[PDB]
RNA sequence: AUAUAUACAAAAUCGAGAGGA
């Protein structure tokens, strides 16, 4: 019933706040900071590990401010939080790749408007 | 996808924890209970960020325990059908490619791998390749893939992938 | 069904199984192989653990289809003295590797050619097609070539392309190639500079400073002309770090000057203490990889997988050396700029591409060496089991037992042939023990069994052997290992063969069978990969690759089974032994069961060896492969001589002085030295055609005694063996100074403490401080358990000093 | 240079009558 491509979600992920893999990243090492210190605490689960490594492997922005800026930039334009996160996580190159990856951007914007959007992403994309 | 959502829980507090430092105990029990688990309604529960409200703790008549209802926020990772995410192959079989989209495990049946690719077990690292090897997926490679189907198993989500359409696969 | 053609084709079974099927050679392909096999299978590894020979062998393997045993036992002169059986197995192992490489090198050849076409249609490939691909001596450098290509030409496939991660292509969008070219010194060249460790190619200055060139290229993805410098450096970096030549030198550098640092993770500081395996390297610093010992890195890496420890491989500087190249001298101040950019480009290359990838490469190399050691050890251990001769068929009696507290002893008399004859159960006390002893002697009198063997489970084997000794004197008695028998018992087959018996009788039959001929029993009870792996060949066995490990173990079996050879008839008439035939070279599980089949079906015994192709349908190549190795107690069949040498052997028989001739020779060698090796060899230049001297030397040997067994003769275990067997832990596992939980029993002047290991623990009188002084109760109450530290061992009596003083405990 | 055990709740319903406080 739930369909990302058709932009369908169950009611719980309507007021949900999305993230970018780099947001999740920085928060997960934040929690590593909490865990490594504060002894007499349970070690983080292998699930926590798998997600940590993954988001680390694909966090396209390695600076907090840059992530914030990315976000903010995606906010000011009418976009769904879902597409917000998919664009920022996937970092597509050309407008047509975006459509292939995020069909829910079908007809929403113009390919050129979108293109300079993507370009704005990429230009904020931090070196690492 | 990763999200940040608000949730519900009631903890029973044994009377040994009445005393100073008892709300901490309500915390620490929320931590030790909710985190690390996976539920199909919400998907992988990565961690709990910030609680909101500790309710009024009702002594249960007889039996001692106090029941505190709690409000809290947590990170969750919930795939959805028709989504495209990056994934890392961990191992390659003639059936398909086992990948993981983070904590979740995903699989791409041979049929879902395009037709050009063939599976080559004979390779020094086993891999799926084209005859000319212009594109080669093997261990540790990152790929994009459409989550075409997901399934619940023991509160554990695993996805079903596809590399059909344009701009998927080997990154 | 695959099994049908395999049973039916004319190649040895184990040839069809292999993933890369075996295709003939060319003798130029073969020479290049042999060179490769030499260099790679005989170059020093990174942790401390003729080509014509390889040529000849590969020829045998790949063109004639001789299996490694036939090469090894019937083409010695070709490959000896420089290849042994294990060497040939290694050679065929690496021939697979060669072929994989050849096939990937081919694939890449085509891919490159296609790209050349496409480029002609429209940088380019000129020699790198030649220079690189043809000169790929290793899969590693093949990936360099391959990834190198994919950087530049990978963009163009003629579905959509699936944009890359590394954002090189974002730069390549905005002509950032312009800058990269304009940094001096194209990456090929730089790699050359490294390769020679001195500035073979000078750089190219420019009439500007970086920024001005940047204004040209600063557009859209990169405004702010510094951002285009960043892109340019990054471009330069990947290009450097993908360049194969850079990779070669830097891969080497890592090989030679690689240090290993280790620290413990939160989880590790706590749980790594003095008995955890990792204790010796919980903290390492600048351990050079050249010093990693045999399996040490396997442990290190396991300990990292357990997360309790964290590691890294590096060189420390190298960067400093390197930067001296891509550099210029004059102080113009418009070159200190370019030099600075140049430098930090190389930083990025090394710091986030090459160092990392080289570290993973090396880790895998090391780790895999370690693995190999472990496999090697497991193989060596099995070699040792299998290389022990039968005792001096024989009626063996085998006694097994258990904890024995309310559990009886069964013994099994196993015939010479190996079939169990009869069994006996042997369950205030002193009279009970006495009655048992009496009935034992009754059994032993009645049915005189040559050898009485007693399991090893614990100290009780000692008393058990000594009682039996006490009996027999009034014909040998031997302690015997019990590890395989445990496996037999637990296995479903033992149920199969003895539905009625209790399990410990199943050990009894086993332990008798193994003493009679260990190879047969191992082969019978190690029937499947799971089974063999149940045995404990090495502590780390569990971590090495199942496939590789099974391979080594099965090859060990193959080796010995061929030396021992297999009598088909007995494997018929006593279906116990059927397992062997699998390992006879030329045969296999499929081919073997087939042969046993036809023989069963026809209800005939192999009267001869030529009866094989004659009466069964086995093709020429397999008969050549195997036939050597099938005893048939036509007299030459029961001898290691091959059927292709029967004529030479008969000739030698005549030259001794032909049924009278042979039987006389068999009755005695009238003149061993009747022969002249040189003379037979000389003739063989025109009759037999080869330097078959050693073959003759063997045939003479074989005429001496038909199938002389080459196993080593049995020896009862050295007391070290007894110790590590009954106690079941190793010279390593008694770490003198280990800490151990022991139980105190009773001051016999001492403090007699029983170890869980079945070991007596004698806290010495010095710590005790009471010989004629009051008993030491005040130090400790009798009855309970304490944990103390070893300070001496008495293996020959199973006693170990211990320690009271927490000073010793610290 | 020694030292023997371990299984689990069995017993119903209806009707009548006689009593007890």
UniProtKB/Swiss-Prot annotation, chain C:
Boundaries of every S1 motif domain copy: 749-805
N6-acetyllysine: modified positions: 376
Q: Where in the cell is it found?
A: Nucleus
Q: Tell me how this protein assembles.
A: Interacts with RNA polymerase II and the DRB sensitivity-inducing factor complex (DSIF complex), which is composed of SUPT5H and SUPT4H1. Interacts with KDM6A. Interacts (via SH2 domain) with SETD1A. Interacts (via SH2 domain) with POLR2A phosphorylated at 'Ser-2'. Interacts with IWS1, AICDA and PAAF1. Interacts with histone H2B and H3. Interacts with WDR43. (Microbial infection) Interacts with human cytomegalovirus/HHV-5 protein UL69.
Q: Where is this region: Interaction with KDM6A?
A: 34-810
Give the family from UniProt: Belongs to the SPT6 family.
Task performed by this protein: Histone H3-H4 chaperone that plays a key role in the regulation of transcription elongation and mRNA processing. Enhances the transcription elongation by RNA polymerase II (RNAPII) and is also required for the efficient activation of transcriptional elongation by the HIV-1 nuclear transcriptional activator, Tat. Besides chaperoning histones in transcription, acts to transport and splice mRNA by forming a complex with IWS1 and the C-terminal domain (CTD) of the RNAPII subunit RPB1 (POLR2A).
Q: In which tissues is it expressed?
A: Ubiquitously expressed.
Q: Which gene encodes it?
A: SUPT6H
Q: What's the name of the protein? A: Transcription elongation factor SPT6
Which residues of the complete protein does this chain represent?
284 to 1287 of 1726
Coiled coil segments of this chain: none
């Amino acid at each position: 019933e739930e369909d990302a491509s058709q932009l369908i979600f169950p009611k719980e992920f309507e007021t949900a706040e999305t993230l970018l893999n780099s947001e999740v990243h920085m928060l997960l090492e934040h929690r590593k900071q909490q865990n490594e210190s504060a002894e007499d605490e349970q070690e983080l689960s292998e699930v926590f590990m798998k997600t940590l490594n993954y988001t680390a492997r694909f966090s396209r922005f390695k600076n907090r401010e840059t992530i914030a800026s990315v976000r903010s930039l995606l906010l000011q334009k009418k976009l769904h939080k879902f597409e917000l996160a998919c664009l920022a996580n996937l970092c597509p190159e050309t407008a047509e790749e975006s459509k292939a990856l995020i069909p829910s951007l079908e007809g929403r914007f113009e390919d050129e408007e979108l293109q300079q959007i993507l370009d704005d992403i990429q230009t904020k994309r931090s070196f690492q | 996808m990763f999200y940040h959502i608000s949730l519900e829980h009631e903890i029973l507090l044994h009377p040994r924890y009445f005393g100073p430092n008892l709300l901490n105990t309500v915390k620490q029990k929320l931590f030790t209970e909710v985190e690390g688990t996976c539920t199909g309604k919400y998907g992988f529960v990565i961690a709990v960020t910030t609680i909101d409200n500790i309710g009024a703790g009702v002594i249960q008549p007889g039996r001692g325990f106090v029941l505190y209802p709690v409000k809290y926020k947590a990170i969750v990772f919930r795939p959805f059908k028709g989504e495209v995410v990056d994934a890392v192959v961990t191992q390659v079989n003639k059936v398909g490619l086992f990948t993981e989209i983070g904590p979740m495990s995903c699989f791409i049946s041979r049929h879902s791998i395009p037709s050009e690719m063939e599976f080559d077990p004979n390779s020094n690292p086993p891999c799926y390749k084209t005859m000319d090897e212009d594109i080669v997926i093997q261990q540790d490679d990152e790929i994009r893939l459409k989550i075409v189907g997901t399934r619940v198993d023991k509160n554990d989500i695993f996805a079903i992938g596809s590399l059909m359409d344009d701009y998927l696969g080997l990154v | 069904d695959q099994d049908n053609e395999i049973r039916a084709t004319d190649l040895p079974e184990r040839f069809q199984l292999r993933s890369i099927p075996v295709k003939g050679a060319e003798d130029d392909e073969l020479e290049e192989e042999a060179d490769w096999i030499y260099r790679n299978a005989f170059a020093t590894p990174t942790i401390s653990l003729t080509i014509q020979k390889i040529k000849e062998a590969l020829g045998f393997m790949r063109n004639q289809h001789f299996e490694v045993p036939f090469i090894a036992f019937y083409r010695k002169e070709y490959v000896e003295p420089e290849l042994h059986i294990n060497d040939l197995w290694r050679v065929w192992q690496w021939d697979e590797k060669w072929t994989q490489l050849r096939i990937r090198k081919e694939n890449l050849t085509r891919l490159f050619e296609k790209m050349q076409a496409y480029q002609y249609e429209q940088r380019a490939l000129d020699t790198t097609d030649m220079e690189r691909l043809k000169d790929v001596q290793s899969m590693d450098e093949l990936k360099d070539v391959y990834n190198h290509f994919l950087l530049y030409y990978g963009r163009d496939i003629p579905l959509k392309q699936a944009s890359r991660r590394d954002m090189y292509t974002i730069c390549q969008s905005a002509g950032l190639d312009g800058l990269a070219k304009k940094f001096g010194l194209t990456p090929e060249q730089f790699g050359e500079n490294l390769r020679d460790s001195y500035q073979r190619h000078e750089t190219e200055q420019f009439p500007a400073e970086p920024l001005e060139l940047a204004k040209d290229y600063v557009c859209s993805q990169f405004p702010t002309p510094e951002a285009v410098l960043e892109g340019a450096r990054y471009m330069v970096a990947l290009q450097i770090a993908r360049e194969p030549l850079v990779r070669q030198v830097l891969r080497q550098t890592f090989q030679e000057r690689a240090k290993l640092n280790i620290t413990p993770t939160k989880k590790g500081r706590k749980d790594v203490d003095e008995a955890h395996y990792a204790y010796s390297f919980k903290y390492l610093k600048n351990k050079p990889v050249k010093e990693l010992r045999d399996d040490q890195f396997l442990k290190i890496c396991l300990a990292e997988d357990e997360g309790l420890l964290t590691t890294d491989i590096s060189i420390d500087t190298y960067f400093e050396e390197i930067k001296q190249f891509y550099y210029r001298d004059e102080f113009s101040h418009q070159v200190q700029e370019w030099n600075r950019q140049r430098t930090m480009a190389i930083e990025r290359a090394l710091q986030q591409f090459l160092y990392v990838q080289m570290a993973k490469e090396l880790k895998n190399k090391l780790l895999a060496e370690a693995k190999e050691y472990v496999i090697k050890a497991c193989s060596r251990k099995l070699y040792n089991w299998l290389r022990v001769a039968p005792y001096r068929g024989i009626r063996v009696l085998g006694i097994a037992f258990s904890s024995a507290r309310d559990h009886p002893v069964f013994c099994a008399l196993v015939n010479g042939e190996g079939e169990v004859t009869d069994f006996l159960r042997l369950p205030e006390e002193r009279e009970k023990k006495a009655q048992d002893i009496e009935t034992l002697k009754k059994f032993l009198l009645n049915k005189k069994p040559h050898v009485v063997t007693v399991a090893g489970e614990n100290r009780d084997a000692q008393m058990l052997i000594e009682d039996v000794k006490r009996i027999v004197h009034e014909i040998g008695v031997e302690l015997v290992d019990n590890e395989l028998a445990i496996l037999y018992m637990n296995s479903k087959k033992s149920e199969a063969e003895f539905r009625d018996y209790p399990p410990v009788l199943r050990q009894a039959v086993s332990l008798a069978r193994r003493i009679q001929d260990p190879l047969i029993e191992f082969a019978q009870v190690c029937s499947s990969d799971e089974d063999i792996l149940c045995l404990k060949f090495h502590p780390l066995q569990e971590h090495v690759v199942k496939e590789e490990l099974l391979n080594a173990l099965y090859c060990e079996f193959i080796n010995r089974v061929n030396e021992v050879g297999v009598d088909v008839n007995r494997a018929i008439a006593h279906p116990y032994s059927q397992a062997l035939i699998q390992y006879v070279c030329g045969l296999g599980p499929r081919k073997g069961t087939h042969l046993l089949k036809i023989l069963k079906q026809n209800n005939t015994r192999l009267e001869s060896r030529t009866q094989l192709v004659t009466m069964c349908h086995m093709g020429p190549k397999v008969f050549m492969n195997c036939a050597g190795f099938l005893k048939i107690d036509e007299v030459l069949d029961g001898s290691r001589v091959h059927p292709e040498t029967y004529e030479w052997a008969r000739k030698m028989a005549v030259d001794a002085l032909p049924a009278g001739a042979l039987e006389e020779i068999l009755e005695n060698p009238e003149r061993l030295k009747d022969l002249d090796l040189d003379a037979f060899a000389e003739e063989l230049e025109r009759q037999g055609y080869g330097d078959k001297h050693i073959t003759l030397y063997d045939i003479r040997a074989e005429l001496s005694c038909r199938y002389k067994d080459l196993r080593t003769a049995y020896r009862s275990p050295n007391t070290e063996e007894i110790f590590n067997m009954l106690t079941k832990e190793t010279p390593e596992t008694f770490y003198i100074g280990k800490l151990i939980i022991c139980n105190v029993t009773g001051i016999a002047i001492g403090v007699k403490t029983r170890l869980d290991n079945g070991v007596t623990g004698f806290i010495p009188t010095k710590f005790l401080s009471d010989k004629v002084v009051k008993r030491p109760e005040e130090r400790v109450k009798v009855g309970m358990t304490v944990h103390c530290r070893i300070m001496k061992i008495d293996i020959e009596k199973f006693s170990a000093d211990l320690t009271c003083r927490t000073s010793d405990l610290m």
